[PDB]
Amino acid sequence: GMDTSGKQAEAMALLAEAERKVKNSQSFFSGLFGGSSKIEEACEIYARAANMFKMAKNWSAAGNAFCQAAQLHLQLQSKHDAATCFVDAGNAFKKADPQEAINCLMRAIEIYTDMGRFTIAAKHHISIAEIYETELVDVEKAIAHYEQSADYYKGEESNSSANKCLLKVAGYAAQLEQYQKAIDIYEQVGTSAMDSPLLKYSAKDYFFKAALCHFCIDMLNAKLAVQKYEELFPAFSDSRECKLMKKLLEAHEEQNVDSYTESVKEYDSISRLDQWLTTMLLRIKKT
Amino acid sequence: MAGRSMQAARCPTDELSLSNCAVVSEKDYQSGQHVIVRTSPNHKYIFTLRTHPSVVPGSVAFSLPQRKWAGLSIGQEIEVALYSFDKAKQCIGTMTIEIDFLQK
Numbered sequence: 001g002m003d004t005s006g007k008q009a010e011a012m013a014l015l016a017e018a019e020r021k022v023k024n025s026q027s028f029f030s031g032l033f034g035g036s037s038k039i040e041e042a043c044e045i046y047a048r049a050a051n052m053f054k055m056a057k058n059w060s061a062a063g064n065a066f067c068q069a070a071q072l073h074l075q076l077q078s079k080h081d082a083a084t085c086f087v088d089a090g091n092a093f094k095k096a097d098p099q100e101a102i103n104c105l106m107r108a109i110e111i112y113t114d115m116g117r118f119t120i121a122a123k124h125h126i127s128i129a130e131i132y133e134t135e136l137v138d139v140e141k142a143i144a145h146y147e148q149s150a151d152y153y154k155g156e157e158s159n160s161s162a163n164k165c166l167l168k169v170a171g172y173a174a175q176l177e178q179y180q181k182a183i184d185i186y187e188q189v190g191t192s193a194m195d196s197p198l199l200k201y202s203a204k205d206y207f208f209k210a211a212l213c214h215f216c217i218d219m220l221n222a223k224l225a226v227q228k229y230e231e232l233f234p235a236f237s238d239s240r241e242c243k244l245m246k247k248l249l250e251a252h253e254e255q256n257v258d259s260y261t262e263s264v265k266e267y268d269s270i271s272r273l274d275q276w277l278t279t280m281l282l283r284i285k286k287t
Numbered sequence: 288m289a290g291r292s293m294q295a296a297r298c299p300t301d302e303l304s305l306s307n308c309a310v311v312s313e314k315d316y317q318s319g320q321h322v323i324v325r326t327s328p329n330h331k332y333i334f335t336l337r338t339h340p341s342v343v344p345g346s347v348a349f350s351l352p353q354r355k356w357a358g359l360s361i362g363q364e365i366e367v368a369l370y371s372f373d374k375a376k377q378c379i380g381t382m383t384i385e386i387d388f389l390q391k
Contacts, residue, residue: 220360 007056011049015065018045022072036076043069043076050088059096063089067104083111087124098135102128122152126165139176143169163189167206171276179213186210194233207233208241212277215284223249252287260285290325290368295359296346299339303350309334310348316369324357325366332357333370 025038046069053062070085090104105124113121129145132138146169150162170185190206193199207229215222226245230237244267251260264281267273273281293315298304309322316322318338324347325331334353342348347367349359359365372378 218361220354221362224360 004056007052008058011052011056011058011061014045014052015049018042018049021045039072039076043073046072047085050092054092059092063093063096063100063104066092067100070104079111079114083108086111090124090127094131098131102131118152118156119158122149122156125149125152133172139172143172163192174213175276175279179216182213183210186213190233200235203233204236204239204241207236208239208245209277211241211245212280216280219249219252257285288369290323290366293365293367294346295361295363295365296342296348297361298348298350298353299341303337303339303348305350306337307350307352308337309353310339310342311336312342312344312346313338313340314344315347316367321370321372323368323370324359325368326357326359326363330357 021038022042025034025042028034028038046065050062050065050069053059053065056062066085066089070082070089073085074082086104086108090101090108093101093104105128109121109124109128112124125145126149129142129149132145133142146165150165150169153162153165166185167189170182173185174182186206187210190203190210193203193206196203211222211225211229214225222245226242226249230242236242244263247263248260251257251263296310299310303310309324316336316338318336320336322334322336323331324334339348347365349357353359
């Protein structure tokens with residue numbers, strides 16, 4: 001519609017005007033020493049151009065304009081507004097140019113953490129990890145950023161947020177075929193969650209998952225861990241999870257795979273299963 | 288004599304699994320030597336040793352029946368001390384067995 005062409009033309013004109021203004025700013029400063037008013041006016045024009053490009057759906061141009069404004073205002077010794085523009089560029093380029101958004105968010109993280117604002121740095125780290133996982137299959141970078149964000153939030157004593165990041169890291173690690181870390185993280189979260197009335201009800205689930213994660217290591221330790229969980233968290237015994245694990249262990253004890261799959265199918269019929277649990281159960285069933 | 292901390296391992300071969308004797312490395316013990324295996328202050332079990340090279344040093348291999356009776360697991364830490372039977376009184380003159388079917 002008219003939006004595309006009109007916004008493109010007007011944004012191009014405004015950006016050219018800003019470019020001419022910044023070009024003449026050097027001469028103005030040399031001949032008269034106007035100060036930084038011209039640079040601030042040019043930065044305002046560039047921010048306006050970025051806003052129009054964002055409305056124009058040309059994400060790349062808006063991100064580039066935001067980056068230029070961030071650089072120019074950082075040259076003006078205003079690191080806070082420079083970081084604001086860098087975060088704008090990161091969240092604009094996120095969809096258009098993921099790599100550019102990555103470096104923009106990294107620069108914003110550096111600028112913010114220079115001031116000790118650990119919460120914003122942790123949020124940016126979480127954003128970077130989320131982008132890495134969603135777009136790329138570089139699990140290691142996502143895990144590193146998640147761990148850094150969890151450490152940042154732990155240093156802020158903000159509980160209930162590091163727990164979810166640690167759980168995500170543990171689940172992805174278990175998917176990566178490293179179970180000791182997953183077992184430890186799940187057990188730690190479960191023991192942190194028992195005392196909480198609200199989360200106690202979900203605690204059992206964590207325990208169950210941990211017990212399944214220890215199943216691959218060896219049967220004997222699986223039975224031992226089942227006993228330890230039953231004795232330490234007696235309420236867990238009431239849940240159907242204990243019965244399911246006991247039936248699965250009984251089926252494995254006699255190589256009775258048919259009973260194993262019948263029980264798994266019945267439980268799936270009762271409640272649909274998740275991809276992670278399905279993969280874990282299938283991998284166990286190979287033996 | 289004094290006893291040393293050791294690692295639990297899995298039985299290497301079916302013959303020694305049926306022998307009902309813990310398989311050990313020659314560098315640690317020798318075949319026929321008795322041992323006492325401690326898993327806790329109240330849990331000491333007496334085994335007789337048989338040697339097989341495949342056992343990695345620092346570990347003792349047990350058969351599935353042994354692991355079920357003593358509750359031993361792969362990778363578990365134990366204390367192993369060489370043991371001597373008092374043949375003046377610990378010799379076996381009579382013994383009773385309840386024989387069942389291992390495979391139903």
